[PDB]
UniProtKB/Swiss-Prot annotation:
Subcellular location: Cell membrane
Function of the molecule: Cadherins are calcium-dependent cell adhesion proteins. They preferentially interact with themselves in a homophilic manner in connecting cells; cadherins may thus contribute to the sorting of heterogeneous cell types. May associate with arm neural isoform and participate in the transmission of developmental information.
The record's note on its domains: Three calcium ions are usually bound at the interface of each cadherin domain and rigidify the connections, imparting a strong curvature to the full-length ectodomain.
Tissue-wise expression: In the embryo, the protein first appears in the mesoderm at stage 9 and is present in the myoblasts and muscle fibers by stage 12 and stage 14, respectively. At stage 12 the protein is also located in the axons of the entire CNS, but not in the glial cells. In third instar larvae protein is expressed in the CNS neuropile, photoreceptor axons and precursors of adult muscles.
Top-level taxon of the source organism: Eukaryota
Protein name as catalogued: Neural-cadherin
Domain Cadherin: 2-99, 110-200, 209-298
Length: 298
């Protein structure tokens, strides 16, 4: 027949990242066949010998919604053959955006007399694909319409002139969506009127240290965010065993080893459970978090 079975083949965007690179060889039914493209294609040239070469550096986003380099070839040696070539192009960078806001869950405060269009928090997601653009939006507003999000910047801004209530929680569920390839999870943003307690940069902390850890060496750094941007004082208590084995820097949040350790001494536990407290001298507010320290033998 005049038409050959359609050549189907899969390559990544990156396989086509260099002009003139021979991606694949089109097969010939007879030794003396020569190839020629039917229509000029922006992405590929076809050599006389059937080698398919990168013309313009492949860009998945720039392909039609089909995501294929789709072209025909003429085969000869008139009595000529025709064959369709469909290169399915895979965008291997195309993985969903994720929020890079820290700490999670998303927490902000709103000034009680915040005037309209006061920014209270900036949503920041990252698309691992550098070639993608994302839009931020609210999927569920539990604030009674007191906040909106800028789709470009991710900035969350107050609306209306009414006051906000002290200690009152305003909740938005927010999402960033890809304009190319997927989205973030629908994350919960908690905005509290006026002030709220410090939030640790991790919901729990875990350290693993050898038996021979040097006395007064740093074991783990703990940090809490003060929403009032006020001074944080850290304290550390032991849950059960190990009181006084570790301390934490009042200002630094750095947990050091206070005592020598013996793994073969069964008086000392192998897993220490500690609670770190972050205290604002901004008045009252404290938050606690678990710190778990495991000791390995050496
Ligand atoms: Ca791309
Ligand atoms: Zn036939
Ligand atoms: Zn591009
Ligand atoms: Zn891409
Ligand atoms: Zn990956
Ligand atoms: Zn890319
Ligand atoms: Zn949009
Ligand atoms: Zn804007
Ligand atoms: Zn009102
Ligand atoms: Zn949903
Ligand atoms: Zn240090
Ligand atoms: Zn500051
Ligand atoms: Zn500090
Ligand atoms: Zn030992
Ligand atoms: Zn002992
Ligand atoms: Zn606990
Ligand atoms: Zn041992
Ligand atoms: Zn040993």
């Amino acid at each position: 027949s005049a038409v050959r079975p359609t050549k189907r083949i899969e390559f990544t965007e990156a396989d086509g990242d260099t002009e003139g690179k021979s991606v694949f060889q089109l097969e010939k039914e007879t030794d003396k066949e020569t190839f020629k493209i039917r229509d000029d294609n922006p992405w590929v040239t076809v050599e006389t010998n059937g080698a398919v070469r990168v013309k313009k550096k492949w860009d998945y986003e720039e392909l039609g919604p089909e995501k294929t380099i789709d072209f025909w070839v003429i085969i000869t040696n008139k009595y000529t053959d025709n064959q369709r070539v469909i290169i399915l192009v895979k965008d291997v960078n195309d993985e969903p955006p994720y929020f890079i806001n820290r700490p999670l869950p998303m927490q902000a405060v709103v000034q009680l007399n915040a005037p309209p269009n006061t920014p209270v928090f900036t949503l920041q997601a990252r698309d691992p694909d550098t070639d993608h653009n994302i839009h931020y939006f609210i999927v569920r507003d539990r604030t009674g319409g007191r906040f909106e999000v800028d789709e470009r910047s991710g900035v969350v801004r107050t609306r209306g002139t009414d006051l906000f209530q002290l200690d009152m929680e305003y909740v938005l569920y927010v999402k960033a969506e890809d304009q190319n390839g997927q989205s973030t999870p629908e994350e919960r943003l908690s905005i509290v009127g006026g002030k709220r307690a410090p939030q640790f940069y991790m919901p729990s902390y875990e350290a693993e240290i050898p038996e021979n850890q040097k006395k007064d060496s740093d074991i783990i750094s703990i940090k809490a965010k003060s929403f009032a941007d006020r001074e944080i004082r850290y304290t550390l208590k032991a849950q059960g065993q190990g009181a006084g084995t570790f301390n934490i820097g009042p200002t630094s949040g750095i947990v050091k080893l206070a005592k020598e350790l013996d793994f073969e001494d069964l008086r000392q536990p192998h897993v220490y459970s500690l609670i770190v407290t972050a205290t604002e001298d901004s008045g009252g507010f404290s938050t606690s978090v678990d710190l778990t320290i495991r000791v390995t033998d050496v």
